[PDB]
Symmetry: C2
Subunit: 399 residues, 2 copies
């Protein structure tokens, strides 16, 4: 047996173990644009309750038209990183528009928020510095942190007392600069980071405060600017990383927003910015149109908020165990991996598409169905979805 073929046998063995443990992820092949309803290649039509399409801009007509228009004016690809020939006027406009929207001095575009986080920490922090992360921070944050030389600390999820403990320990350990960093909204439980308390605690220690706003930009806060607006610390955030691929259009792109000197050093040294393609013109142009829409009217985020209240109230009424909160991410606790797999499959048969999370992604006993509201859904369709939850929940003994 050659080593190379043994390698492939070990890969196949691992895949079979995943299957046998019930952990294998199945891709359902969608035939339609993204929307409130979709249809797979086998003709099954479903209400879609597990997209990041919070404001319905993924297939909004003015967004699609801005994309067509930018293809005509600025082309399909730039085939270049930003410093060579990959910067259009579109990119500078979007960076300025995002800076104003988020309350920061400047913004640097990336291909994705995953790469914004990956390219963040290594440039800004070194071995004498500390990063203090919420224990449930997003994977892309951890990997950016692991690529840096920074000292690593974690505080218990949303635990301000433990955040103080970690800031105390980082100080005792002799940290030069300290960055407290957290998801603004955590996708697994929909909780909203306590940014007002974190800002005050950061100020006590002279620490920086950074947030990852992927599940917030566009609809958190009264004007939809983000978790920092909702928590009353708009303009008091050192670093915001975020995505264009969720509420703000759903195609691609991400960004880091900060003081102008941080953004400037990121352009000079951040490895995904130096060594990965610029954002495509059509995505940049559509994103400017997204900001035009969201700065003109709060109607879409107001509709998302009403849809979220309606669905949270209905699940509560039916008897489900729903994680507390008001976020469009609505986690329905079902404890067992098998119960979650059964509920997601039964809902699919009933015309409702959700996603389940279970061990080892979440702890034993913490299995859940993750529903995500959209401004797209109307309350009649949401009621039809609640009826499917009611049916499957009664069948499976959950309610």
């Amino acid at each position: 047996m050659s080593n190379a073929e043994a390698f492939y046998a070990s890969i196949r063995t691992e895949l079979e173990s995943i299957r046998a443990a019930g952990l294998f992820k199945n891709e359902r092949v969608i035939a339609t644009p993204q929307g409130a309803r979709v249809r797979t290649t086998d003709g099954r039509e479903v209400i879609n309750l597990c997209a990041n399409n919070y404001l319905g801009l993924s297939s909004h007509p003015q967004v699609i038209e801005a994309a067509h228009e930018a293809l005509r004016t600025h082309g399909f690809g730039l085939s270049s990183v930003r410093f060579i020939c990959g910067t259009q006027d579109l990119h500078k406009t979007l960076e300025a528009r995002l800076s104003a929207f988020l309350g920061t001095e400047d913004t640097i575009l990336y291909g994705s928020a995953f790469d914004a986080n990956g390219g963040l920490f290594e440039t800004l922090l070194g071995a004498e510095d500390a990063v203090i992360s919420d224990a449930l921070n997003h994977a892309s944050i951890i990997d950016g942190v692991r690529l840096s030389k920074a000292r690593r600390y974690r505080y218990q999820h949303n635990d301000m007392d433990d955040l103080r403990v970690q800031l105390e320990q980082a100080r005792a350990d002799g940290a030069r600069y300290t960055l407290v960093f957290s998801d603004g909204v955590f996708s697994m439980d929909g909780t909203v980071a306590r940014l007002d308390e974190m800002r005050a605690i950061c100020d006590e220690y002279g620490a920086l405060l950074g947030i990852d706003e992927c599940h917030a930009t566009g609809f958190m806060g009264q004007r939809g600017r983000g978790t920092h607006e909702a928590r009353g610390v708009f303009g008091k955030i050192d670093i915001i990383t975020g995505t264009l691929g969720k509420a703000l259009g759903g195609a691609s792109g991400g960004f880091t927003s900060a003081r102008k000197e941080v953004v400037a050093l990121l352009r000079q040294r951040s490895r995904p910015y130096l060594f990965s393609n610029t954002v495509a013109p059509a995505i940049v142009g559509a994103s400017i149109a997204v900001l035009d829409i969201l700065e003109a009217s709060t109607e879409l985020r107001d509709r998302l908020e009403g849809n979220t209240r309606f669905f949270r109230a209905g699940l509560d009424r039916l008897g489900f165990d729903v994680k507390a909160g008001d976020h469009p991410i609505i986690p329905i606790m079902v404890y067992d991996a098998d119960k979650a797999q059964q509920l997601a499959q039964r809902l699919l048969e009933l015309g409702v598409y959700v996603v389940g999370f279970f061990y080892p992604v979440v702890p034993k006993g913490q299995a859940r169905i993750r529903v995500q509201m959209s401004a797209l859904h109307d309350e009649a369709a949401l009621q039809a979805a609640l009826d499917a939850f009611g049916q499957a929940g009664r069948e499976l003994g959950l309610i």
Copy 2:
């Protein structure tokens, strides 16, 4: 002085030292689509010889139209990672077409080749395994390896004798599985990895062979399939990572192409695939058209080969210091960063758009102008550019 404000003082001091060293990159703001000629916002139209637009596909009318069409049929964004609700039939089609184009069993799309590399090594290798890298491997390869637990070895650039030394050492150290990984064509010097020799050497040690084809897919080899075709080892590569953002359209996206079980495990476990947005439908649809074009005729990669031979011969005639090779990446070595920026600035005045390359993009003391040829240019424009290079080079004491 608070630690937080001291942090910004540290950042500003570093920015000033970059400027004082002559290593500060400035962005030019392009007002037009990508093409053989572009115009900046100030109105100056110039010949672009520094794009990854190797085959002219970034603004090819059939490629632009395929993007319009996918916008109409499949929408602007999917706002989901692949496994939840971000897989359309387009994605599966592109993955099948890339696999056939590249000679592999299956393909997994990423948002970028930077992400493909970042998510490769940690998924497939463990603490008992080894990765053996060419010393000049791309930053995205290095960061992917750093994120993994594999034991790291480096061999001297394009040195097969030293590659054997490292394979021997890795075996002596007790490696379980060994992956030799190299740029197929190196981004900064244009050299072509000796994949035929590396395949033979890998076979002797039972090692896997992986390549990053970003500056190769579409135009290397007689049918433009890649470096492996060019080196006679098509169908004998374990792992291909690559981009859609260079010759294959220039917008966004990347991929890993491999045996079906490797691709399957990457879908289950690769962090950039699990935790970053799916590729936008318009980019997927246009990439399918790109492969229709390139599989129907080799005329574009043939025109690129002729333009490259003509331009290298002209630069040689004029007396420039050019890295040896035949690749469309033509590195004009100036060593000193100041003179790199001086040459690029003077060429712009003379009607030619190139950009100085210097640290950290290339090593200190090894600054250069990376010229890149494209199928787009006609001989008359290349001759005009040669004349500009001659005049600028003589003005600047370079030739």
